[PDB]
């Protein structure tokens, strides 16, 4: 369904003034299509559908955008949106970056001592660091 | 016996050219006295005997000096004598500082799997680092 929607989108709709109007020349909602795409694991399509909706109505879902940026295979992703800067957010940022200064080992040690998939993150950081 | 030795060394020697040779009025080898003092747990006294012996014979026991400086209460000890660096001198020097740069945690982690005392040094390094 996403493929046929995109395929109709590329073709020039009849008596359509705007190419984006040709995208909506079939009346569809881009948020639900983008959610289905991200559930279909083809993330570039989900990003395209988000861009369609934002260019139309500016209705980007922050949760969906953050999740897409996370799971997206591109290297410089997951930094597209800036989450509320808490300890957990910088813990995730460190475990994704895998940095030695202010290493995620310190953050996960704080989590374990304070009893706050953190275990998987700690083990991954330990194995990827070298210890 | 060490108390008598020191008491006699302190006294003014009649027709004695040097206070140095006055410290050697009773013929003895100060190196064995210093080793006994180190075994007597009076490390400052052991260093005094070691330096008087080195003033006489210039024949200090390097291993004995390292053993003395390992337990000396002064914080800026352990660096008087340099041990030619190997993968055991780096670890032992980093244990004392308990520092995160040039991580003693890293060297301990490497040695715990390369199999190159440690069962307490590692735990104390981890505790001192704060993890």
From Swiss-Prot, chains A, B:
Subcellular location: Nucleus; Chromosome, Telomere
Annotated function: Serine/threonine protein kinase which activates checkpoint signaling upon genotoxic stresses such as ionizing radiation (IR), ultraviolet light (UV), or DNA replication stalling, thereby acting as a DNA damage sensor. Recognizes the substrate consensus sequence [ST]-Q. Phosphorylates histone H2A to form H2AS128ph (gamma-H2A) at sites of DNA damage, involved in the regulation of DNA damage response mechanism. Undirectly involved in the phosphorylation of rad32 which is necessary for its telomere function. Required for the control of telomere length and genome stability.
Subunit: Interacts with nbs1. This interaction is required for phosphorylation of histone H2A.
Homology family: Belongs to the PI3/PI4-kinase family. ATM subfamily.
Protein name: Serine/threonine-protein kinase tel1
Species name: Schizosaccharomyces pombe (strain 972 / ATCC 24843) (Fission yeast)
